[PDB]
Symmetry: D3
Subunit: 266 residues, 6 copies
Amino acid sequence: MIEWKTAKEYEDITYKKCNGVARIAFNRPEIRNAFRPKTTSELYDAFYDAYEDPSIGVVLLSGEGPSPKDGGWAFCSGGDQKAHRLNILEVQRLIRFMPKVVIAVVPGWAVGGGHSLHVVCDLTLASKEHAIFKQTDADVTSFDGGYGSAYLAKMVGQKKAREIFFLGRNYSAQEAFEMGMVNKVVPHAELEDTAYEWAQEILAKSPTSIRMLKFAMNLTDDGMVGQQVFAGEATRLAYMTDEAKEGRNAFLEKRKPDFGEDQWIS
Amino acid sequence: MIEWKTAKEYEDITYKKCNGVARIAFNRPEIRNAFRPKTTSELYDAFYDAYEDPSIGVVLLSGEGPSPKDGGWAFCSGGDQKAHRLNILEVQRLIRFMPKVVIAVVPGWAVGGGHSLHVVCDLTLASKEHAIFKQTDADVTSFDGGYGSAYLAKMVGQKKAREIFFLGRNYSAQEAFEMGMVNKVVPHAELEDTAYEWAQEILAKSPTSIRMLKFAMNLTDDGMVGQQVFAGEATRLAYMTDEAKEGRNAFLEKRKPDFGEDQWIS
Amino acid sequence: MIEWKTAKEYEDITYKKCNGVARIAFNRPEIRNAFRPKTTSELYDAFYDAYEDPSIGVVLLSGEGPSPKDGGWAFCSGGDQKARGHQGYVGEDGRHRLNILEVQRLIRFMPKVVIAVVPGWAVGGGHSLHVVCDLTLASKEHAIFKQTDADVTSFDGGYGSAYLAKMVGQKKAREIFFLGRNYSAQEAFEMGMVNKVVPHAELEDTAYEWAQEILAKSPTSIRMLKFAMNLTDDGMVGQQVFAGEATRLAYMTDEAKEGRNAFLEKRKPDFGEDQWIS
Amino acid sequence: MIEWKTAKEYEDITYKKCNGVARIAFNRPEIRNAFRPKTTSELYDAFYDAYEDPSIGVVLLSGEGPSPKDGGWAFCSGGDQKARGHQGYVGEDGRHRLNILEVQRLIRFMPKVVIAVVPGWAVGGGHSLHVVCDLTLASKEHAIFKQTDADVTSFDGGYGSAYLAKMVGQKKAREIFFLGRNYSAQEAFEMGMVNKVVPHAELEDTAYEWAQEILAKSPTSIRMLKFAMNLTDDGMVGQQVFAGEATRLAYMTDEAKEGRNAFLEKRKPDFGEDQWIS
Amino acid sequence: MIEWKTAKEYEDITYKKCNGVARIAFNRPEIRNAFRPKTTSELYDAFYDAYEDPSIGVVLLSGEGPSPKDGGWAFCSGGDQKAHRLNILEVQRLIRFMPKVVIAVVPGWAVGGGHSLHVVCDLTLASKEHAIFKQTDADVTSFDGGYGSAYLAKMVGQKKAREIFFLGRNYSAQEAFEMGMVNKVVPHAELEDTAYEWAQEILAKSPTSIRMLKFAMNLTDDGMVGQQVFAGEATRLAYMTDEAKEGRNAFLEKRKPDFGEDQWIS
Amino acid sequence: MIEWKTAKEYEDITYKKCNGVARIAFNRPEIRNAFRPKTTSELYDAFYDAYEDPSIGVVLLSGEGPSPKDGGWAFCSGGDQKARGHQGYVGEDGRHRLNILEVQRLIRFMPKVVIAVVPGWAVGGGHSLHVVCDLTLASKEHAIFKQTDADVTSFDGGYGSAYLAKMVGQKKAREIFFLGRNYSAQEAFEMGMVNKVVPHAELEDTAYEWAQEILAKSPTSIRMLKFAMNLTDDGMVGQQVFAGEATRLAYMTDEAKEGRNAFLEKRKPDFGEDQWIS
């Protein structure tokens, strides 16, 4: 079994770590893991901790369950329509920009804002038997006009993204795999174990490659922000060079740098 | 049965309305619903009427049939190669920018400019038995270098869009569904009824959500024009606020607006 | 003297043509040439006529004046706030519309050069109309540029602001909207949104002379260049427009005559040998 | 006199508030207001407080001074090279971080106008901080803009350079980085990256007056306009931010009250008739 | 049989031509067709020849085989990790910008830089039995942050592109077809013949259409460079007009051009 | 005096090198330095040599002169219209080519700074060559910038026009092409497409001094900064070029040595602990 260690106690979510993997999970299954403002604040807190922890290279975002009421399963049913407060867009940006791979692990309903959270994650694994993808934004006069819709079109195409939002129908794990927004359909009993196995495959890679590749694939859609993030990681690589040591040292010693000869390579 | 009411009489197309749905259909099945300049002018006229009619939230673009010659079915075979005149690009832009969902209903051949008309529609439903998607632009030294090709890549990907144009082969409804440019394969006998059912599901949604979501998904590809259209709808939402009432009233009364305290929320 | 001939009669604007130039001008100077819904409908009607007239290569967008009330000059002071309500400007048919945006797109996409001719105040939506025009000429003495959107809980978040940054840069575009200060013609020239500062008495004549210089150029070049400079900002729409003009050029070739002829004759086209040039 | 009240005490910066304006200023003038990791953490902390304070609509980012050592004035001379090492700047916790980029994004995304107030040298990373601010006011006598990145094998390849080209153009942005020369306040104004050249003794007061002009505007307009002018360059992130503010406007409508109420009551919403307006 | 004619002799590749088709193939099957710097230089040389040859409209990029060691098949295993030198990015740009259709023909392993070469080609045909797609960049602290990853997302979507790079797993021809980066799965014995048949279908099209369509589909992703290339081909079309003859002639004769009347069409 | 050494002999251009600078200059001043197909081939050949020479960090692109015929100075007057025909410029091999675009891309992508040095007329395609260079220095007395594309049914719809708008803004770029008027060096500086107005007798020496200032910088910084400022406009190609230089930096790390060594040795790489930094 996976030897999870609780990282912090929360009211609406769980947060655990094991061998380079952090798992953040919605923990209100009695109401199908809808988020209220308290939930979003805790999500931000846990994701920010994972962002700052250099031992963590992969974050799993999942849902606990099943519901004690009807035995049903949920990833996240979106905004608790009953309800500065940290909002879900700041959480989306933290997922997007952090130099860690974020995997949505979907055991059940992924609805509305819960659907858009799955979309912005780098990868999605979904329960064969119980994942249901559904967009209710247009039912309640809301809309995720950013990562939930326009970015959804970057994985399922523009026709299917429009269908998802305009009709608000349900889609199975297999249907979502066939359209391009689920990476793998996994038998429910194996979903969490398989998510951890995927995470460990990533954690065996070059961390520099993983960071640079995440940020390259963000860059094509994220404009100047994506450029800022990708270029910032490149600045980090330049800083490690002997050329950078000379640049800094010459500045500190108040002398002209000598960067060498025949350096204008191609 | 659907209780269609004829909206206007045309020579080359039909135009009818029912319960929030407008249907515009090519009506030259004897020549597989090719468009001539008269056809394009009528298309523009009917789409513009639907654009201006606040009762209409969904436009179906279809083809009448079958051919009296051979019993075959067509959506639209594109430009009548026999032939300011309103051209098909102005029709494409009207489909693209109107705050209504436009559904291509494809009962048969969708060829050349007819193919590109299906592509720019927000959704496509296609006849299982009789829809055939085919791009003939490269056969006749033409090209739709905008919504027909580059935008096709935003729903089927860049490899498949290139194949469609470079080889000009035929694709079935099922093949087109699997590549991402058809939303649903529908038995021919149910195609028109199912299109109307899809339309009624959309018409039950929030019209503000539908407009904003269409324009958000346009925005990612349509650059400054997409920004103009999306921001224009946001300006409309701002105008409804009490803050806007005060802005207008203060201007008219030649006094400084009082927008209140602690308004710089996040 | 320019031999203008009135093209159509309107309530809120004037529309005249001469030797390849159309002039559309706001004609409600007593209220500083604000546009009400009727004005916007008439603007669309005149611009679309110019778009469809193949003798017209340049459209001047100007303002008549001065005010008979107080002697002030205006290009356009933006939306008439007396018509503003819920969801937009309320027309005589009851609709709440924001269709100056449709006028903006007509200006943007038409294969003709549109020159804003600014004899006075250019405020709010009137400022944004100047911005979306291809060129702007401004009265030295009396043109004043001012963005009031943020005063009245409005915003042009498209061609009025983001596109403004493509001619004056992002710092200056932000300044114009966030503070809503006045800028003279010379300041507007120095920041990059005015092409030429002209003495007021010469402004209309100079706009006509600019138009005649454009009309002496290759119309294909002018179309393709306008659409190329649109393309870098207009995304897929800009691509549709620019590629569409390219398709028009391909249609003229002997290669396309063969493609169409082979299709009509049910035979395989013969496009020749060694055609894969670079 | 401005009645500033200290909001929080910091080691390397000052943070004060008055009547809707927050002022964050570098306060290590003896080393020309360079930032070390502690400075960057404190900048983030103060900017995030301003972001969360709904009374604050404008943030001034300035520099204290002059140096008591040599009398020189600085806005910010960039990263403290004594803290620079492998992989970035080394903090007291041992981490090698480049988190001025997180500060840059906080400035960029916050629904408040951030004005760089430049009383002296703005060098390197300090130059790039001025660039990402919404507006810049500069000391006529003493502001000097200089990019040293290429001298020390560094580069700001995002908001410091590519975004600089969105206010001064691509030729001038390339010049600033490739040669690393000095530019006065007036040169910086003429190229488009400084909004106003101000006498040094009036710089801080004028920045406050600019802030008060913004604070008299519609806050919805200011937010939507900042995010519209961000959107044209910030791609999907800019779309997320701008659309998110639009979603906030939709939430306020009676239409959204019906959507939410129908959902909570397990009934079909009734959004009315003839709603498909244009 | 296809009557190939050897175009030039090389050490690490083969280069042949037949009836408008050029074929460039990796020819180091004993090491699974990895490229060393010599290989990349030869690739550039052969592609540049094909670019300059007006008889050539389609280039096939393939791999020779099988390995004499184990009978295995390879397209290209990427960089020979053993190893101005022409590098693979200049080859990618030559493939991208040349006014010819480039088809990746994948008979076996397509790994690392070999995978990214398949991605940038306009079309990909793959061996049903033996093609294996695998991204090893993250195993060796490398990354193709351009056409290999961000452009891969333009054909398989952002979720699947991230999976390919972050986990570095193997994918079959059929799996690659289902995600969108392979145009057709072909029985191994028919792969090369089918690639030539595809090429001949392209070569029967309008060369102007093919060029303009390739460059239109590049334009949506290639920014100002894509604009330069697409507009350059449009300049070529303008030069052919009688209007251009008058423009040139008036310049040479030092007189005002007369471009005619009523030319401002729409 | 600069100790130039001729690098290669050409018919239509000169090509010399000194201390890290290459100078490529048009050398047909009797026809105002127009380029024929042979010129374009030679330009490509010289630029590619400079690209491959690791001692060369800066390339000056200039014009020789004056004309011995009429004493006039030219940078480059664009395509030689005597060679223009169907489908492009006709070379000695019979091909109709537009391969100044290949030269434009070589300038754009090479990891060296290219400075246009403009001693005289810069017209048409010669104007567009100046635009795509990273920097432009211009003769105060004699540089004249003029776009004739629209006079001859041509257009540079890429780096010549859309990219021009990224340094002078969209209104001015439209003016330059639609009217085809002359602009002095000072006007070109004021609009943002010229970096420095230089006395004619000092122009070449000042270009060399600018080059030496760049050559004293970090070559990695200069490469990464050029490619970062390209990236914001060059889309996926710009991303390919910038990311490719980043891959080169990763290759140098001890982490990459381990990745490659583990691969060659058929073992799992050990990239260390706590590596997921931020």
